[PDB]
Write a protein that binds this ligand. Sequence first.
Ligand SMILES: Nc1nc2c(ncn2[C@@H]2O[C@H](COP(=O)(O)OP(=O)(O)O)[C@@H](O)[C@H]2O)c(=O)[nH]1
Ligand SMILES: [Mg+2]
Lengths: 165, 156
Amino acid sequence: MTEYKLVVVGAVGVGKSALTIQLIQNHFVDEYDPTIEDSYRKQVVIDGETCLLDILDTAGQEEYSAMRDQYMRTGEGFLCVFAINNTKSFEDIHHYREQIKRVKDSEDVPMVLVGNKCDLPSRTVDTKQAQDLARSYGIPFIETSAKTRQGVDDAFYTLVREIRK
Amino acid sequence: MDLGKKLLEAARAGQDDEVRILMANGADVNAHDTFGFTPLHLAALYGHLEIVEVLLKNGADVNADDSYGRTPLHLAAMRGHLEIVEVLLKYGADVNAADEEGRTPLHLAAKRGHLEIVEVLLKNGADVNAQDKFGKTAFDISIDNGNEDLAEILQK
Ligand SMILES: Nc1nc2c(ncn2[C@@H]2O[C@H](COP(=O)(O)OP(=O)(O)O)[C@@H](O)[C@H]2O)c(=O)[nH]1
Ligand SMILES: [Mg+2]
């Protein structure tokens, strides 16, 4: 069965770990420690092909990581996560996309833009602004809620579909 | 009064004074957040040796595990906190403890490239050949990463 090395990137507190745990464990976490960088795995069925997900949930980017750099060189898809209530996280997408382009040495890498915490009533980051950025990058944009599971499978599924292409 | 939260925070932040005081007023060394981190997990993860010891000496559970099955030893290995790994063992940490994926501390250290910790775990009776629930072992991880120095340790 096929293995996909997925990298989850984005600013601290956007809900990367909360997304990873909702996908693999089917449970929401409030409080998950913000510097634990682990790679969780998950067997799924995507479009009739049993396949294995090997997801790195980046944390602690402040400090250096041997295994994080190795995941970045080798990784196959990227989830670029921002929070819909954090304008700084949206701005940081620019730096993450550019960093991926440089480590991978390629204008075209499998990527999905994720606007997390869409379960939330107040929203500082407009749907059009996010859709325009994804449309300028030529990549899908998916709204997600790690709390309600909305769009969570879709985000990880679409990325696997983008690697197949 | 919720001194469990006040103790966890203190353990993470490396405030050995606040930890001493908090326990003196009967704060529970096996408090845990909504994902099962004990003060020991946090101290280990964040590299706080004096705090790790004072927690253990005060009866903290060394083989406590979070809701993904990780012991404090797992986390100490994860980060490459060598002197902590040793004292966790000296106080009875299970070397071959397996998280929800079946990974032992050897897998995690091997995977991060923490070779000094791999050497020490093996010396305390780590099982070189244990498979996680997807079949992988330390040696699978060395080949999967092209890590030459690790694959060497795992033979001669
Ligand atoms: N309402 C809501 N809260 C979330 C969501 N995702 C994460 N959070 C919360 O935001 C905090 C940060 O999540 P975390 O996974 O630590 O993000 P990370 O720091 O990127 O790994 C936690 O308290 C989560 O409960 C979401 O989709 N909706
Ligand atoms: Mg996190």
